[PDB]
Amino acid sequence: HMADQLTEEQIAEFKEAFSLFDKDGDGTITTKELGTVMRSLGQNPTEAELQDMINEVDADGNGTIDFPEFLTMMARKMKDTDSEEEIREAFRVFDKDGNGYISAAELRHVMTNLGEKLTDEEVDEMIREADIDGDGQVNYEEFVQMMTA
Amino acid sequence: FFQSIQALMQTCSVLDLNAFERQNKAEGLGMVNEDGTVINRQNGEKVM
Ligand SMILES: [Ca+2]
Ligand SMILES: [Ca+2]
Numbered sequence A: 001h002m003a004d005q006l007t008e009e010q011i012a013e014f015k016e017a018f019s020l021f022d023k024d025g026d027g028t029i030t031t032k033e034l035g036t037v038m039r040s041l042g043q044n045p046t047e048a049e050l051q052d053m054i055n056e057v058d059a060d061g062n063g064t065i066d067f068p069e070f071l072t073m074m075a076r077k078m079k080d081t082d083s084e085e086e087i088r089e090a091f092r093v094f095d096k097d098g099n100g101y102i103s104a105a106e107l108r109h110v111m112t113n114l115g116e117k118l119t120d121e122e123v124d125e126m127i128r129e130a131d132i133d134g135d136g137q138v139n140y141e142e143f144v145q146m147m148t149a
Numbered sequence B: 001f002f003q004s005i006q007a008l009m010q011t012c013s014v015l016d017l018n019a020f021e022r023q024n025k026a027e028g029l030g031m032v033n034e035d036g037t038v039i040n041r042q043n044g045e046k047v048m
């Protein structure tokens, strides 16, 4: 949903961008309006591709781009940036310091913040399971292949 | 009066396993809202 993907500030910024394209203010983006801003940016496209880049996001097929369609375009662009990198943030939650290894103390820190509590001994049980190298720290490579700590 | 009473009694709900099964899956998803985050919203029970 747009509320999940976009914040109030981003919606305001997109509206200003939409109004930059819509010099008329009627609420729709025509080919000439889209072509004008492209020339200001240096590009000189033809109407054949200019229509194509409109039809690619025009939902109702009226031939013009309104704000609901403009927001829907930007909502997809924000969403599809992250595809499978969600494990990177999950790794950094356990990795407080910022290096490439998860320490037992760092695993204690996240477990302390979470509801479940450890008796300072079973923390070694799952870290040695995740850490195959046996160095006492779980790196990023060990975390993605199998997640226990 | 009695036609209304009889109709009301026929619309009274009983234990529905299909509704119960749906709720168990629904509570297992753990949904949240956009503006902030709701902790397992307690919207109306659908079993009786
Ligand atoms: Ca216009
Ligand atoms: Ca349209």
Ligand SMILES: [Ca+2]
Binding pocket: A095, A096, A097, A098, A099, A100, A101, A102, A103, A106
């Ligand atoms: Ca670390």
Ligand SMILES: [Ca+2]
Binding pocket: A131, A132, A133, A134, A135, A136, A137, A138, A139, A142
């Ligand atoms: Ca290791």
